[PDB]
Amino acid sequence: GKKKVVDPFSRKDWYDVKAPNMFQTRQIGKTLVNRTQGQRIASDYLKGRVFEVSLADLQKDIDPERSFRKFRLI
Amino acid sequence: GGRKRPVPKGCTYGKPKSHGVNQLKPYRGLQSIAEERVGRRLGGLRVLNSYWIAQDASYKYFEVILIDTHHSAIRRDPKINWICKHVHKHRELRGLTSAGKSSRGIGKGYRYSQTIGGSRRAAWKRKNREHMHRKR
Amino acid sequence: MVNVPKQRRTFCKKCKVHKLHKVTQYKKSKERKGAQGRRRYDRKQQGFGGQTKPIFRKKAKTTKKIVLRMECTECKYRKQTPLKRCKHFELGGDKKRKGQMIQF
Amino acid sequence: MASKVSRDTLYEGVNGLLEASAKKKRGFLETVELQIGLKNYDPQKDKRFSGTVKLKHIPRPKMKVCILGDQQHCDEAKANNVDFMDAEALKKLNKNKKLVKKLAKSYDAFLASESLIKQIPRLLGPGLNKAGKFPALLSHQESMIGKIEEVKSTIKFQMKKVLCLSVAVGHVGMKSDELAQNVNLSINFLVSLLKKNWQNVRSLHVKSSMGPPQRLY
RNA sequence: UCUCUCAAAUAAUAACGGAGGUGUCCCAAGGCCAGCUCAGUGCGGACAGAAACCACACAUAGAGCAAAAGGGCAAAUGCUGACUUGAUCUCGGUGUUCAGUACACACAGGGACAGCAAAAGCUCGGCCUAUCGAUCCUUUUGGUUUAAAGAGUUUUUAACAA
RNA sequence: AUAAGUGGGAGAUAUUAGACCUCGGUUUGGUAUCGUCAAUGAAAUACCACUACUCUUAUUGUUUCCUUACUUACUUGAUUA
RNA sequence: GUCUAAUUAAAACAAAGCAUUGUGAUGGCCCUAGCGGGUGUUGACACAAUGUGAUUUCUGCCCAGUGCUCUGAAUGUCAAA
RNA sequence: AGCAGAGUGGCGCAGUGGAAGCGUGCUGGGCCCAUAACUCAGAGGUCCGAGGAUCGAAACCUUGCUCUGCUACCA
Numbered sequence: 001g002k003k004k005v006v007d008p009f010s011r012k013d014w015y016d017v018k019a020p021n022m023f024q025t026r027q028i029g030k031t032l033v034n035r036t037q038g039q040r041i042a043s044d045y046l047k048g049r050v051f052e053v054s055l056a057d058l059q060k061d062i063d064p065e066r067s068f069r070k071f072r073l074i
Numbered sequence: 075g076g077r078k079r080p081v082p083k084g085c086t087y088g089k090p091k092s093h094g095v096n097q098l099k100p101y102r103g104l105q106s107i108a109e110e111r112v113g114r115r116l117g118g119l120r121v122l123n124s125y126w127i128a129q130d131a132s133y134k135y136f137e138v139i140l141i142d143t144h145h146s147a148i149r150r151d152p153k154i155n156w157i158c159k160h161v162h163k164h165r166e167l168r169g170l171t172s173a174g175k176s177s178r179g180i181g182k183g184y185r186y187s188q189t190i191g192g193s194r195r196a197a198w199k200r201k202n203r204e205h206m207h208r209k210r
Numbered sequence: 211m212v213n214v215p216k217q218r219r220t221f222c223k224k225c226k227v228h229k230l231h232k233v234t235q236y237k238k239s240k241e242r243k244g245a246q247g248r249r250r251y252d253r254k255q256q257g258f259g260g261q262t263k264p265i266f267r268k269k270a271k272t273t274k275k276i277v278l279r280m281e282c283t284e285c286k287y288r289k290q291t292p293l294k295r296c297k298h299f300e301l302g303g304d305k306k307r308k309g310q311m312i313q314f
Numbered sequence: 315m316a317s318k319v320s321r322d323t324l325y326e327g328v329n330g331l332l333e334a335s336a337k338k339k340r341g342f343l344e345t346v347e348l349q350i351g352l353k354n355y356d357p358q359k360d361k362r363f364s365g366t367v368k369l370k371h372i373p374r375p376k377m378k379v380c381i382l383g384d385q386q387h388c389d390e391a392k393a394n395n396v397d398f399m400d401a402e403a404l405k406k407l408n409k410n411k412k413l414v415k416k417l418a419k420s421y422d423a424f425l426a427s428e429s430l431i432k433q434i435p436r437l438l439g440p441g442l443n444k445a446g447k448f449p450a451l452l453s454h455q456e457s458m459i460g461k462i463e464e465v466k467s468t469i470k471f472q473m474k475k476v477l478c479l480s481v482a483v484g485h486v487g488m489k490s491d492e493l494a495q496n497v498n499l500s501i502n503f504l505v506s507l508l509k510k511n512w513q514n515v516r517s518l519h520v521k522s523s524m525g526p527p528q529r530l531y
Numbered sequence: 532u533c534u535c536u537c538a539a540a541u542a543a544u545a546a547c548g549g550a551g552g553u554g555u556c557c558c559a560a561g562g563c564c565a566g567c568u569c570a571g572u573g574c575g576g577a578c579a580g581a582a583a584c585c586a587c588a589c590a591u592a593g594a595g596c597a598a599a600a601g602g603g604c605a606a607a608u609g610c611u612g613a614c615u616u617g618a619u620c621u622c623g624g625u626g627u628u629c630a631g632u633a634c635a636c637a638c639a640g641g642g643a644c645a646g647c648a649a650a651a652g653c654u655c656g657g658c659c660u661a662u663c664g665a666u667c668c669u670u671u672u673g674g675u676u677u678a679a680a681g682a683g684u685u686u687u688u689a690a691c692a693a
Numbered sequence: 694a695u696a697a698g699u700g701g702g703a704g705a706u707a708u709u710a711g712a713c714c715u716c717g718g719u720u721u722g723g724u725a726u727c728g729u730c731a732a733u734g735a736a737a738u739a740c741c742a743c744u745a746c747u748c749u750u751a752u753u754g755u756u757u758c759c760u761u762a763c764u765u766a767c768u769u770g771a772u773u774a
Numbered sequence: 775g776u777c778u779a780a781u782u783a784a785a786a787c788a789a790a791g792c793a794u795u796g797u798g799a800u801g802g803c804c805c806u807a808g809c810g811g812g813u814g815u816u817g818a819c820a821c822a823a824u825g826u827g828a829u830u831u832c833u834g835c836c837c838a839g840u841g842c843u844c845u846g847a848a849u850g851u852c853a854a855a
Numbered sequence: 856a857g858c859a860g861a862g863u864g865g866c867g868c869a870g871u872g873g874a875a876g877c878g879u880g881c882u883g884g885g886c887c888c889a890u891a892a893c894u895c896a897g898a899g900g901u902c903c904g905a906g907g908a909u910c911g912a913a914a915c916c917u918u919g920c921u922c923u924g925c926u927a928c929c930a
Contacts, residue, residue, distance in 0.1 A: 077807095082807085290673085306559085309611095444736090482702070524706085
């Protein structure tokens with residue numbers, strides 16, 4: 001019988017996600033992770049996750065020759 | 075603990091009053107049970123008493139007081155001479171040991187009026203006797 | 211339907227006078243332990259002989275005789291009266307009315 | 315959350331209560347109120363708290379009581395310094411407001427004689443009942459012998475539908491000894507009125523008008 | 532359990548005899564008094580006919596009195612108004628059943644206290660004849676009384692009366 | 694005005710001057726601020742609650758209690774341990 | 775193929791086949807009051823528990839009722855501690 | 856007897872102190888050749904009963920009826 005307050009949005013922290021070195025922009029973001037409880041490992045609930053963004057956009061090739069080519073991050 | 079009736083798992087042949095198996099309990103204390111077992115193996119030593127040291131779940135710890143009646147120290151020395159008398163052979167089974175005396179329930183007075191007058195068997199016999207005097 | 215008035219003038223032996231009494235129904239009042247036989251009753255049942263005292267079944271008894279508790283306003287001394295068997299007891303009765311319409 | 319004089323965790327004695335003079339921080343004469351909670355007194359049911367008490371040492375009131383008086387009853391009250399009116403006053407009081415320096419509800423309290431109790435519920439009823447000044451036998455306005463009571467301190471007390479009772483027992487500028495009799499006497503009448511509850515009085519309080527609560531044994 | 536009959540004219544009296552009913556119903560359908568006259572018929576009265584309400588004459592119970600049936604009754608026991616709670620308290624008797632006992636219900640009284648009516652009187656339920664239950668036990672109401680056995684007090688508790 | 698309700702009620706606060714004071718202060722007059730009252734309602738709320746509602750948080754003690762850590766209890770399995 | 779030795783040898787029983795049920799062993803099913811043990815020097819192609827009855831062919835509809843079952847809303851009801 | 860739950864237009868079901876609402880059925884209009892279907896218009900409430908509370912009760916309270924489930928008791 002859990003029952004949390006409400007507005008769990010006003011319980012989910014803040015975090016920055018870094019992209020890779022040899023691309024261009026090593027910030028790809030900031031995004032909203034669960035607040036670290038000693039009854040939740042928020043760090044593990046950042047680790048297993050896999051994303052895809054097309055490299056063209058991150059590379060910021062304005063007229064994108066790279067537009068198609070989809071790229072995955074972990 | 076509970077001395078669960080040695081029943082065949084067949085229901086105990088008779089009246090509903092006798093149908094309890096597991097809630098049926100020793101009229102003899104666990105002190106005495108400790109003594110009687112020792113006494114059969116050690117039939118040459120005569121048991122005075124038993125006292126407790128410790129208890130967890132399955133077992134109760136006792137130290138049992140054993141006397142050598144065939145040792146001339148104990149023949150020797152006047153206070154304990156009377157224990158060498160043949161009247162004290164296995165006290166434990168006759169409850170002349172402290173454990174056994176309590177289970178047989180011999181206290182003066184009233185709370186024990188039946189059974190102090192006769193030891194536990196004896197009281198029954200006196201009561202149920204037609205004492206027929208000759209000169210009726 | 212036995213209709214019964216909320217007020218009845220009847221004899222009360224403390225006033226030694228016929229005085230007005232407020233009328234109430236008696237009912238039956240909860241079984242209590244430590245009752246005299248109940249203390250004994252429980253020991254007798256004490257367990258593994260299986261339910262000692264015979265369980266009364268064959269109940270045809272459609273009603274019960276009502277007792278009215280009549281309590282004198284002046285001396286507060288209370289008087290018991292039993293009445294004859296009737297299913298439906300009412301007090302301040304909604305007292306049946308003579309000739310009454312059945313209308314239009 | 316209480317001022318340094320009173321600790322809110324401490325149930326003050328009736329002797330300790332008298333320290334209401336500290337709680338009149340306001341330069342002017344605050345009213346002392348005695349504030350009682352009722353428990354398992356079902357307020358919707360026939361357990362209806364109604365009473366009057368005459369407080370030995372007066373709430374400091376200017377009480378003008380108005381009588382509708384028939385026969386000897388008018389005379390009786392007249393001796394006891396009542397405003398003195400004889401049923402023909404219904405028609406002055408109601409229909410219109412008086413004139414100058416007087417409102418047609420220039421009465422603090424209302425009394426009507428039993429003979430005159432036919433006329434007032436029809437005529438006076440809309441204006442009086444909304445005020446709550448309406449004379450009931452539970453409000454104990456016999457105001458002749460009730461008049462020496464009323465001016466010299468009679469307060470009525472009635473249960474709210476949330477089942478609370480809120481009494482005025484005094485003014486704070488009243489000597490401590492005099493306050494003690496008024497709080498105890500008010501209480502003693504409340505105790506008389508209690509219809510069979512397990513714990514009819516669950517907490518007793520006395521509070522100053524601008525000023526911090528006291529919890530009372 | 533009760534009525535009528537069987538049941539042979541006191542009473543008693545049976546069969547898986549005959550026709551039936553009872554576990555309730557009712558603050559009046561109790562209690563009391565006053566007034567009234569019903570079943571039914573005849574004769575008048577727009578709406579009114581065979582039957583509606585109104586009006587008079589006749590009329591032994593043929594009606595109505597909760598109910599089964601049989602008794603009973605006409606300034607009532609019925610019907611309608613009025614006033615009410617004696618359908619009460621207490622103790623004893625009596626009838627039935629037949630030990631003429633238990634029980635239930637009924638009948639007449641003594642001691643209370645009344646209820647009603649002008650009163651005389653009547654009235655311990657229902658005009659009479661059915662309508663309901665032992666001990667232990669549960670419980671309440673009663674006097675506020677006795678005991679809880681080494682003394683009190685107070686909870687609890689045992690009880691005696693109905 | 695939105696009184697959760699409701700009892701009683703016959704004013705309470707801020708400022709300034711004068712008198713009194715050692716002084717917070719007290720008395721008196723004026724001034725400013727809603728009001729019991731006026732206004733007019735279900736209760737009148739200056740004047741506060743007593744009971745309580747619905748939201749939230751800290752903290753101890755207590756109680757309901759779930760998970761996870763150790764191995765020396767117990768349990769299960771293998772061996773000239 | 776079996777049986778009511780001593781009145782019933784069959785159409786009954788069993789039976790292969792067919793289908794259904796539980797269980798990964800600190801289990802399932804089972805005995806013993808208990809200790810301890812059977813299946814089991816067995817390991818799901820096993821063991822245990824059922825029902826129908828070769829081959830061929832067919833296996834419909836019905837979980838309302840009575841059994842059986844469940845990671846089921848499980849502050850229904852609900853004991854002692 | 857303990858405890859819990861249910862009863863709202865004919866029917867099925869919503870409703871948290873100010874009011875009577877939806878769907879489906881039902882009636883008529885119209886769409887349409889016609890009906891089916893749809894669209895439109897109207898009709899439809901002792902809120903199971905009674906009483907209390909409060910200015911006002913389906914609403915809250917309580918008692919009673921009715922239904923429903925478990926469970927204890929037992930002269």
